[PDB]
Amino acid sequence: QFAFVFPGQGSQTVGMLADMAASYPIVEETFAEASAALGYDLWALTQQGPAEELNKTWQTQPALLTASVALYRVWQQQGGKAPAMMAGHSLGEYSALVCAGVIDFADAVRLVEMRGKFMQEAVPEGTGAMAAIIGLDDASIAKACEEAAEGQVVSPVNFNSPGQVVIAGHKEAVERAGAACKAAGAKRALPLPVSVPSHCALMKPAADKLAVELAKITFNAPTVPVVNNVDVKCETNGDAIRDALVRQLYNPVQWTKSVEYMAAQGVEHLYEVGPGKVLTGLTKRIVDTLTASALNEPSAMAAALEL
């Protein structure tokens, strides 16, 4: 039994999905739908860049959601069976929810564009930071962040695997937390090309804006279980899912525990339905007996459809 997992920011690259689009017309057809919603040519953005434009979050997010939905559509078109479960990393959660039939595609494209804008405006450039903490246990990091906060905000924001955790918050507090993590025995505390301090308390007022927009959008029952980032729960209440997306924005992404949870339900393989191999690489680090592979190249797509 397999699940589909959907990547978020960082997995985009100029030229992504080029090979798949050349093999499957539905890819550019899907991007053409997104572009109509956005008011610009999203495919052209992904194929021509420049990178700096693709990497701006209110453009990254629709690019990624569309790429993922395109790949899902290829899978389905070529006769692939629905996965037993889905999950997605931050932005990826929206992709999962579209593929599970909860949110209309065009609605979701507009939604994640607005999500990215709300995120971008949350704090002044230069106020926030993120850092990757490598080689320290979840608990020790949370403690380092507590000690370091001193009335600013810093907390774990991505639990990506055992030994790979991102923290974020106000820049000074992230610096202090970083140092503390090193002192507690972390192998690295590496500062990231951040800006937006995602998934911490600084995103509350952005979440409050997002909630207003989510409320305007119809949510349907999922046709496949989607494990959410914030609670590691498969909500079905249209209005409960919507509600979990709000809290997602200012709470940590529980990726490690989400991958554990899928394995506990009997999932044996994760297919990464998006560009890159980021979630693929995390998988064995979380559960060493899980396997994973990506579905963003024609040949791999063919190979999975043969199974």
Side-chain angles (χ1 to χ4, degrees), residues 38-123:
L38 289 162
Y40 64 88
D41 190 339
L42 190 61
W43 180 245
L45 173 61
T46 66
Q47 294 309 290
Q48 299 170 215
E52 190 183 344
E53 288 301 315
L54 189 49
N55 290 344
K56 292 169 170 183
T57 176
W58 63 96
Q59 298 176 343
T60 306
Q61 286 186 51
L64 286 183
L65 178 104
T66 299
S68 285
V69 171
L71 295 170
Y72 193 77
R73 288 179 169 190
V74 169
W75 179 256
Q76 282 217 304
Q77 184 188 59
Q78 299 307 118
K81 304 149 161 190
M85 287 173 77
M86 324 181 158
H89 195 287
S90 195
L91 178 277
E93 186 151 311
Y94 288 77
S95 305
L97 287 174
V98 172
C99 296
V102 173
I103 313 176
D104 165 81
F105 173 46
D107 283 346
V109 169
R110 292 185 282 258
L111 232 29
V112 302
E113 175 178 59
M114 285 187 288
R115 190 176 178 269
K117 293 178 184 175
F118 294 150
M119 285 167 54
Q120 195 62 60
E121 82 185 0
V123 304

Side-chain angles (χ1 to χ4, degrees), residues 28-274:
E28 281 165 88
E29 297 186 331
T30 298
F31 272 86
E33 249 185 281
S35 281
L38 289 162
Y40 64 88
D41 190 339
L42 190 61
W43 180 245
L45 173 61
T46 66
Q47 294 309 290
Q48 299 170 215
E52 190 183 344
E53 288 301 315
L54 189 49
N55 290 344
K56 292 169 170 183
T57 176
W58 63 96
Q59 298 176 343
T60 306
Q61 286 186 51
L64 286 183
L65 178 104
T66 299
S68 285
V69 171
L71 295 170
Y72 193 77
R73 288 179 169 190
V74 169
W75 179 256
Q76 282 217 304
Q77 184 188 59
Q78 299 307 118
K81 304 149 161 190
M85 287 173 77
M86 324 181 158
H89 195 287
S90 195
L91 178 277
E93 186 151 311
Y94 288 77
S95 305
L97 287 174
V98 172
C99 296
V102 173
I103 313 176
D104 165 81
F105 173 46
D107 283 346
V109 169
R110 292 185 282 258
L111 232 29
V112 302
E113 175 178 59
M114 285 187 288
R115 190 176 178 269
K117 293 178 184 175
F118 294 150
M119 285 167 54
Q120 195 62 60
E121 82 185 0
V123 304
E125 295 262 300
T127 295
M130 311 189 107
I133 311 297
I134 279 163
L136 193 178
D137 71 271
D138 280 351
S140 290
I141 295 175
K143 164 172 178 256
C145 288
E146 287 162 355
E147 300 187 328
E150 290 302 88
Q152 297 186 287
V153 169
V154 58
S155 51
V157 296
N158 277 9
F159 297 99
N160 285 336
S161 63
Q164 302 193 320
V165 171
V166 183
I167 69 172
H170 269 147
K171 108 166 189 84
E172 295 85 3
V174 168
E175 295 169 351
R176 289 190 301 267
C181 283
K182 281 291 267 239
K187 166 145 184 70
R188 296 211 173 75
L190 273 136
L192 325 66
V194 6
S195 196
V196 190
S198 307
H199 303 341
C200 72
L202 289 177
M203 283 290 167
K204 187 40 166 61
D208 283 357
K209 293 180 173 284
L210 184 66
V212 172
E213 297 306 325
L214 285 164
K216 298 188 194 167
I217 297 305
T218 297
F219 276 52
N220 311 294
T223 63
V224 314
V226 177
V227 186
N228 72 206
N229 280 353
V230 68
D231 288 342
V232 190
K233 287 186 61 191
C234 299
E235 304 284 357
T236 53
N237 173 250
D239 312 306
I241 292 165
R242 196 193 275 104
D243 185 82
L245 292 172
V246 180
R247 254 180 330 116
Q248 191 209 45
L249 208 72
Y250 64 97
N251 286 285
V253 179
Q254 304 286 165
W255 189 248
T256 293
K257 289 185 166 150
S258 291
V259 169
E260 288 178 336
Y261 182 76
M262 301 198 281
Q265 310 315 304
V267 173
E268 305 180 70
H269 189 77
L270 307 182
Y271 290 111
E272 183 161 17
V273 184

